[PDB]
């Protein structure tokens, strides 16, 4: 995902859990040279990222 610069990793994972009802393993964030905050969110192994991506609509 990409988020605004004010979000913590805890805030990001809580938001992901609420909006997409998926458990989250960890989060890695970096502020991109454009300016936003790219966040790599690794899920719990018992969920499937490809399935969640199809559910959200990106594929």
């Amino acid at each position: 995902f990409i988020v605004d610069v004010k979000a913590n990793k805890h805030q990001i994972k809580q938001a992901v859990k609420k909006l997409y009802d998926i458990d989250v393993a960890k989060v890695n964030t970096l502020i991109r040279p454009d300016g936003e905050k790219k966040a790599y969110v690794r899920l719990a192994p018992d969920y499937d990222a490809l399935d969640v991506a199809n559910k959200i609509g990106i594929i």
């Binding site: 502020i31 040279p33 454009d34 300016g35």
Partner: protein, 50 residues
Amino acid sequence: SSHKTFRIKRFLAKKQKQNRPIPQWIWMKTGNKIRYNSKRRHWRRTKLGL
């Protein structure tokens, strides 16, 4: 420098976004006097201040 600070990084981000050219559909408006972006900046000619 690879060892930046947050304010400087935001500054560079804004000017990197600013350094793009002009869209073509604006050249077709009614009251258009603009023919190209005159506020361009090349990393080697103009040195951005700082």
